[PDB]
Amino acid sequence: MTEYKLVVVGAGGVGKSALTIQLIQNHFVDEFDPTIEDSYRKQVVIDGETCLLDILDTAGQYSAMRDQYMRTGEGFLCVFAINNTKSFEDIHQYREQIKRVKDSDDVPMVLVGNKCDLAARTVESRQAQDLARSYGIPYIETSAKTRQGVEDAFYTLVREIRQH
Ligand SMILES: Nc1nc2c(ncn2[C@@H]2O[C@H](COP(=O)(O)OP(=O)(O)NP(=O)(O)O)[C@@H](O)[C@H]2O)c(=O)[nH]1
Ligand SMILES: [Ca+2]
Ligand SMILES: [Mg+2]
């Protein structure tokens, strides 16, 4: 069937692994031993259509391996956490690097603000909505913990790949 290659990127500790596992296994894991991090495949139904998601959950930081997953990846979730200002400031660098390897300022992407279940917010929604608008991509707030917005974020990325 149709297979969509999705890649999850962003700074250390924003929730890349928890987000991926929440989508794949429908629960919240508190910690991961990066015995690779790596790749998962899932059959899902999106807009009536059944299809295959191949999701790579990346490390925060081999240049050729990084460039390699950026080049083969079809869509990207760019994750920060709403309680970590530094993670939001790093977003620019992840997006720039993807655009530079793919040779396109039109790569399918969704800006993800994770940990929205938390009280100690340091990044306002309006700031992140502005950044996303500046890139011309959607913004979605998520919580891997409560599952808020998780399906929306991944499913929106797939649609962005189709609408490309
Ligand atoms: N409150 C809350 N905590 C979360 C959420 N998502 C992840 N966490 C917690 O935040 C920490 C980071 O999660 P993790 O998935 O390991 O992050 P990561 O981005 O994969 N880190 P790394 O880049 O080092 O692989 C973990 O302690 C996890 O339990 C969320 O939505 N809400
Ligand atoms: Ca280039
Ligand atoms: Mg991880």
Task: Report which ligand 1 atom has the smallest distance to the Cα of 34.
Answer: 25
The answer to whether residues 128 and 111 touch, using CB atoms and an 8 Å cutoff, is: yes
Please compute, for residue 63, the number of CA atoms within 13 A of its CA located in the half-sphere on the CB side. 0
- Closest by alpha carbon to 58, among 41, 44, 74, 78? 78
Determination technique for this PDB entry? Answer: X-ray
CA of 18 to the centre of ligand 1 (A): 6
- 1-164, CATH topology level: Rossmann fold (3.40.50)
CA distance 20 to 77: 10
Strand 38-46 with 49-57, pairing: antiparallel
Query: Distance (Å, rounded) from C-alpha 89 to C-alpha 85?
Result: 6
Q: Is 106 in the pocket of ligand 1 (CB under 6 A)?
A: no
Residue 103 Cα, ligand 1 centroid: separation in angstroms? 30
**Alpha-carbon gap, residue 99 to 1, rounded angstroms:** 28
Pairing of strands 75-81, 38-46: unpaired
Closest of 156, 158, 139, 146 to residue 19, by C-alpha: 146
Helices 125-135 and 85-102: angle between axes, nearest 10 degrees: 10
Angle between helices 85-102 and 63-72 (to 10 degrees): 70
